């Protein structure tokens, strides 16, 4: 087994497409070792979590950080990661942008982690709006009060410089849909 083609493959699933290995990150973007054990092995089978333990703590660029049995990239990430897990309190709206087909079913239940074990917003509306219209066209956006989501018992962490990540959002913090 050889150690870079390796290190390149960690980089490429720990920094952009996690979910293609079935590999769900947190909020600070760690993901379980053995999983990612588990999923190097489908490429390279000679792969074991002492010489990825090795990869990490000899690599120059620091490009990897082990938490107990968890393991992140530390930059170069191509979704939003929340590190240093720094949290935001001075944040009293949020802003989502979603297509009219899903208008009733948020309205009703509210933003649902799905996929990811978190749920992205954003404290800009130019910037909820334009990722609400990659997701198709017909697009609304939702406000959220934060302080719902604080005194609900949700923390909301800073992942970008306008973007938020929190668990779930409640109908109870829609505040309107525009």
């Known amino acids: 087994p050889e150690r870079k083609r390796v290190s390149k493959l960690m980089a490429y699933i720990l920094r952009?497409?996690?979910?293609?290995?079935?590999?769900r990150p947190d909020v600070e973007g760690f993901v379980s070792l053995n999983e990612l054990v588990n999923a190097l092995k489908t490429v390279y089978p000679e792969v074991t979590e002492e010489?990825?333990?090795?990869?990490?703590?000899?690599?120059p660029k620091g490009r990897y950080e082990i938490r107990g049995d968890r393991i992140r990239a530390r930059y170069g990430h191509?979704?939003?990661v929340s590190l240093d897990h720094e949290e935001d309190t001075e944040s009293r709206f949020l802003?989502?942008?979603t297509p009219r087909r899903n208008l009733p079913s948020i309205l009703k239940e509210g933003?649902?982690?799905?996929?990811?074990?978190?749920?992205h917003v954003s404290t800009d509306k130019i910037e909820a709006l334009?990722?609400?219209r990659r997701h198709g066209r017909e697009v609304?956006?939702?406000?959220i009060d934060a302080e719902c989501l604080r005194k609900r018992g949700f923390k909301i962490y800073k992942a970008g410089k306008n973007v938020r990540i929190v668990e779930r959002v409640p109908?109870?913090?829609?505040?309107?849909?525009v």
């Open 95 to 97: 802003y989502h942008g």
């Open 51 to 59: 010489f990825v333990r090795e990869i990490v703590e000899n690599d």
């Open 111 to 119: 933003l649902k982690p799905m996929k990811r074990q978190y749920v």
């Open 16 to 23: 952009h497409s996690p979910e293609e290995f079935g590999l």
């Open 171 to 177: 109908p109870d913090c829609i505040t309107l849909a």
């Open 78 to 80: 191509s979704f939003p």
């Open 130 to 132: 334009e990722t609400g």
């Open 140 to 143: 609304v956006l939702l406000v």
